[PDB]
Amino acid sequence: QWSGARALEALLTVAGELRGPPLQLDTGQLLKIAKRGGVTAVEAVHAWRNALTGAPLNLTPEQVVAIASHDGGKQALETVQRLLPVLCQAHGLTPQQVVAIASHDGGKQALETVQRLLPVLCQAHGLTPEQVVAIASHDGGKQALETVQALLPVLCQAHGLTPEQVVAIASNGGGKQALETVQRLLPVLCQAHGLTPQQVVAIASNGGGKQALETVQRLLPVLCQAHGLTPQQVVAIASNGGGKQALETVQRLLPVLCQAHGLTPQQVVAIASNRGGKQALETVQRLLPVLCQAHGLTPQQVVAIASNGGGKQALETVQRLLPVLCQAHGLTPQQVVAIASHDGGKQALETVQRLLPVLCQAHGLTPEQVVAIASNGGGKQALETVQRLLPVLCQAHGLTPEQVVAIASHDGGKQALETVQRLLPVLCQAHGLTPQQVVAIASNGGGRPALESIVAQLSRPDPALAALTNDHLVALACLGGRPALDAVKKL
DNA sequence: TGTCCCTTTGTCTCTCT
DNA sequence: AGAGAGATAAAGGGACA
Ligand SMILES: [Mg+2]
């Protein structure tokens, strides 16, 4: 017979007993745990399902799932029940912070290292506990913490990095490798190539890590001589999303794209410069002539779809759904291009196809409103929240559908809608803001933390804002959100 | 196999002018 | 607002006992 047959059975046997109390996990949850944490993780959840739910820890099932769904999830669960009260009472961490640290592969290692190193990192090195939590909250957190402890002096002193930059480099997966590589390659990339320490930090952080830095070192000349790129444009490729893979693939595909399709290097860099750039470039070389045939899409439209994180997925989804959305939903190609030209375009596209008729018929929105909501990053999230929350926001809070669509139509619209739902009563009833003022604050990117900042100030007034009226705070929040408020706090 | 650590890619949210 | 930066997740490889 088959090996895993015994294992899979034990899996299902215990998995079915977890749909009961006190956890009640759905199929999705149960699979996710099975997939990343394994059988033993599923058993551990079961075996420790009462100790984690109730007194003292009182963790949500969602939080138990978060901790369980990684390699060694069994170990993280055991370690959490042991160290969560230690870390909260002895180091002043929130339980949310502890879960954050535990919710990665090798979670046990990270928790124990935090317990062992947070004192010395704050006292001897002057890091905040927040910074320590951030370093610890990725796979290999233990390694990143040990490496920060060890190289913070030499990085700040012999290499001129601020502690902030060091923390920023460290707070990624492979943090250890990024730090060690930055130590070695900073002088090389600085003195030999005219990059600033800042630019090096950017290559090292955000995923690029060691591979991006070594690939910038290796390939920067081959790119700025023959291919005639600026260092600026090389840094941009390696920086965000990037990195190594995008850089290697820009060498391969820069001519093929220009020569045969007539894209500028400018356009190529923009496609290159996201997470999965390599994938994006490739799908473009492959798919562009297919999208622009039969008087179809324009090059510039193909370039714009491609130039966001997951561009490959948006491209393939566009190629696949362009017909059905135009034919059976009445959308113009231009609209479809707008929906797709943001991070997660694939998701927004699929969610528009799925929910446009529902939001139109059941909720009385226009197709234009649905497109506008979809045409932002996280478009799927905003669309699903509008569907869920429109009736309550309108019926229970007095908002117009127009107002709800306005809150929804920015990056993080989901967060903004959920927060207006939470805080509208206390802002208006308890502090006398008008609904329109609330809607205004919330109708920007970052509407959620703008709203929270406002509530903080009116419920636990910082003296440093008291010279401003509600109306002035409101104007400030609309103008530049939380950052503006916090910047005022400093004055 | 279970665990730890690293890399790539995709998605979502917020910032900075 | 449009571009950059930061957060978080998902999934696979290497390594080791
Ligand atoms: Mg982008």
Author numbering: 231 to 721
Copied sentences from the primary study:
When the natural TALE codes were discovered, no code was found highly specific for base G. In light of the structures of the DNA-binding zinc finger proteins where positive charged amino acids such as Arg, His, Lys play a critical role in the coordination of base G, we made a dHax3 variant with an Arg34, His34, Lys34 in the 7th repeat. We then attempted to co-crystallize these proteins with a modified dHax3 box element whose 7th base is changed from A to G. Four complex structures were determined at high resolutions.
Transcription activator-like (TAL) effectors specifically bind to double stranded (ds) DNA through a central domain of tandem repeats. Each TAL effector (TALE) repeat comprises 33–35 amino acids and recognizes one specific DNA base through a highly variable residue at a fixed position in the repeat. The crystal structures of TAL effector (TALE) proteins bound to their respective target DNAs have revealed that the residue at position 13 is the only one directly involved in DNA base recognition, whereas the 12th residue stabilizes the proper loop conformation. dHax3, an engineered TALE protein, proved to be a useful scaffold for structural characterizations. We then present fifteen crystal structures of engineered dHax3 variants in complex with target DNA molecules, which elucidate the structural basis for the recognition of bases adenine (A) and guanine (G) by reported or uncharacterized TALE codes.
